[PDB]
Amino acid sequence: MSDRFVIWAPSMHNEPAAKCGYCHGNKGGNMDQLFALDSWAHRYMNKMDVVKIENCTIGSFVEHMDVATYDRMCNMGFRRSGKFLYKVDPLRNCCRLYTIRTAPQELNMTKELKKCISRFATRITSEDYCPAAVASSDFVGKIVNAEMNSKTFYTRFEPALYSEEKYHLFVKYQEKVHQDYNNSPKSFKRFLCDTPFGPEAVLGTQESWEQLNNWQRMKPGEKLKHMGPVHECYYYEGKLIAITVSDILPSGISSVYFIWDPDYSKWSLGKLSALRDLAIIQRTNLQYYYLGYYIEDCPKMNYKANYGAEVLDVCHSKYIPLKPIQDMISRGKLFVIGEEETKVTKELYLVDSETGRGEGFPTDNVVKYKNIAEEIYGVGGCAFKSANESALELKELYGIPYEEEDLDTIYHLKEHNGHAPNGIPNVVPGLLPLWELLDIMQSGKITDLEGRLFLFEIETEGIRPLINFYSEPPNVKKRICDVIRLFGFETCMKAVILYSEQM
Ligand SMILES: [Zn+2]
Numbered sequence: 001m002s003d004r005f006v007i008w009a010p011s012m013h014n015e016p017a018a019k020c021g022y023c024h025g026n027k028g029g030n031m032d033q034l035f036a037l038d039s040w041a042h043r044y045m046n047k048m049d050v051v052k053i054e055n056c057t058i059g060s061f062v063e064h065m066d067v068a069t070y071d072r073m074c075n076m077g078f079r080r081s082g083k084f085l086y087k088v089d090p091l092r093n094c095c096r097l098y099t100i101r102t103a104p105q106e107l108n109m110t111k112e113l114k115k116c117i118s119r120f121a122t123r124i125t126s127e128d129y130c131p132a133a134v135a136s137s138d139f140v141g142k143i144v145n146a147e148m149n150s151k152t153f154y155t156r157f158e159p160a161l162y163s164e165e166k167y168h169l170f171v172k173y174q175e176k177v178h179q180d181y182n183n184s185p186k187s188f189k190r191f192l193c194d195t196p197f198g199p200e201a202v203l204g205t206q207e208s209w210e211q212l213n214n215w216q217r218m219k220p221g222e223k224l225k226h227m228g229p230v231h232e233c234y235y236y237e238g239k240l241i242a243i244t245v246s247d248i249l250p251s252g253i254s255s256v257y258f259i260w261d262p263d264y265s266k267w268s269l270g271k272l273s274a275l276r277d278l279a280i281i282q283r284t285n286l287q288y289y290y291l292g293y294y295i296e297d298c299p300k301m302n303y304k305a306n307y308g309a310e311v312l313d314v315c316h317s318k319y320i321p322l323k324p325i326q327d328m329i330s331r332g333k334l335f336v337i338g339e340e341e342t343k344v345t346k347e348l349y350l351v352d353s354e355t356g357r358g359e360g361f362p363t364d365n366v367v368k369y370k371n372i373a374e375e376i377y378g379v380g381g382c383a384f385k386s387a388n389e390s391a392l393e394l395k396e397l398y399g400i401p402y403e404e405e406d407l408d409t410i411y412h413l414k415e416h417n418g419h420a421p422n423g424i425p426n427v428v429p430g431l432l433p434l435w436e437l438l439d440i441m442q443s444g445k446i447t448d449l450e451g452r453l454f455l456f457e458i459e460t461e462g463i464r465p466l467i468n469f470y471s472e473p474p475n476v477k478k479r480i481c482d483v484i485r486l487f488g489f490e491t492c493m494k495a496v497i498l499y500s501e502q503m
Contacts (some may be wrong), residue, residue: 004065004454005495007085009479010060010486012424017053022095022298025053033297036091036334039379039399040410050413056093058424058486059086062196064497067227070197071249073487074099074290075358077314077430079254083194090314090429091377092411096332100294101252101319102309104282109137110306116271121146123267124153140279144216152237157212159203160193160231160245169240169259177261192257194247201228215283224248224284236268247276252288253281274307297332313337314430315348316359320369328371334429338372347376347383347433352489377429387426390434398441400481401474402426402434424482432485440489449492455480458500487501 017025025035034053035041036066045053062085077099078087088097114136121142129149134141166189195202208226216391232244242260246253258271276494281289294311295301315336328335376383391402412421426434440446446469453466479499484492
């Protein structure tokens with residue numbers, strides 16, 4: 001094997017809203033922004049006391065997964081945290097969450113960038129050097145020219161292995177900026193050293209490292225050979241000032257975290273790191289730059305939109321610029337693009353093929369897109385009923401343990417305090433719709449999986465293939481269906497299921 005998708009069975013984990021990483025379960029007097037649609041807000045005004053607002057998370061733990069498949073899932077809407085690959089339910093969560101991607105060519109120009117670049121260039125180079133005539137707009141040229149003629153500043157690229165000065169800088173930054181005191185080396189290794197990717201991507205070849213370090217000197221027309229995650233360190237007079245942790249994807253570069261020395265707040269290393277990453281993308285032959293998830297309301301995450309980008313649309317797998325949909329996404333409410341040509345009688349047919357899974361979509365600029373979120377996911381939304389008869393049909397015929405629920409389980413009440421909800425709700429945006437799944441079953445498309453799908457039993461401590469779909473126990477069928485719903489038929493085509501009833 002070289003690229004088998006080996007993970008655990010996805011499960012729905014719920015935690016109280018106070019543990020929210022951005023709102024902490026509160027946003028002030030704007031109770032509407034806690035919800036996703038105003039209709040549910042008006043519905044639950046009477047039930048504000050018994051509303052069990054949580055921080056919805058869906059995901060699973062990964063053991064081994066290829067970098068290209070990671071790119072596919074990152075374009076789908078997932079980014080991993082440590083070794084935990086997950087994404088939130090857009091509808092039932094507490095805070096909104098989208099993925100943004102940026103191109104190096106479409107950067108805007110502001111006075112702050114000019115000032116910071118000028119200060120950095122003045123600092124690193126010698127005072128006797130005369131600056132060239134290259135315009136400040138060409139930031140890549142400015143950065144390269146500044147780095148060519150400096151002796152006190154240099155950066156290096158190394159794998160993600162553990163060290164001691166890195167941990168010292170990490171704890172210094174923690175206790176100085178976030179007042180986190182219980183940091184431990186094991187916690188640091190878990191946070192920034194666990195790697196689902198294989199060792200080949202982790203350690204790489206020395207020639208690849210040489211090319212990555214010589215990135216300022218690569219002529220266009222060559223291919224960047226290295227793949228996987230890397231760490232970038234910013235030396236200055238022989239001592240560390242910052243650490244950049246990121247990864248190299250075939251379609252771009254993503255960012256996860258950043259640590260800098262507290263005493264060097266003068267240089268404002270965050271913006272400099274972002275600009276240097278953009279310069280790396282431009283000088284290299286990569287094309288995009290995934291900044292992470294995007295949250296609108298939260299003031300801590302708003303800075304990511306300064307560079308300008310396009311926020312992902314979960315229900316269509318398309319990328320659209322933020323400018324046309326600014327009013328649509330204002331105040332943090334879920335949206336789905338739509339046109340007057342097509343009605344909303346049934347759910348959106350998510351094309352479960354390569355043409356519609358984590359790849360770009362050239363939109364029709366003639367039509368004026370309009371919000372249809374309240375049409376398909378509103379009080380009179382047709383999703384709930386269709387889900388109901390679909391679940392009834394699957395349970396009646398194929399025996400999959402699907403069950404029906406009343407048209408109010410969008411936000412469960414205090415009754416779920418007795419039993420923690422572990423199942424994936426039927427009504428969830430950006431997922432495979434139930435009726436399409438029923439079409440897959442009834443058309444015999446499920447007959448493709450058998451012969452090359454692998455199911456691992458912890459009880460037997462062995463790996464077994466899928467021979468007959470219908471002969472499996474009902475729980476196995478439920479888990480397989482959930483995986484196919486969450487990640488896709490093509491993804492499950494070349495995956496390995498670590499299924500166990502021991503848990
Ligand atoms: Zn929240």
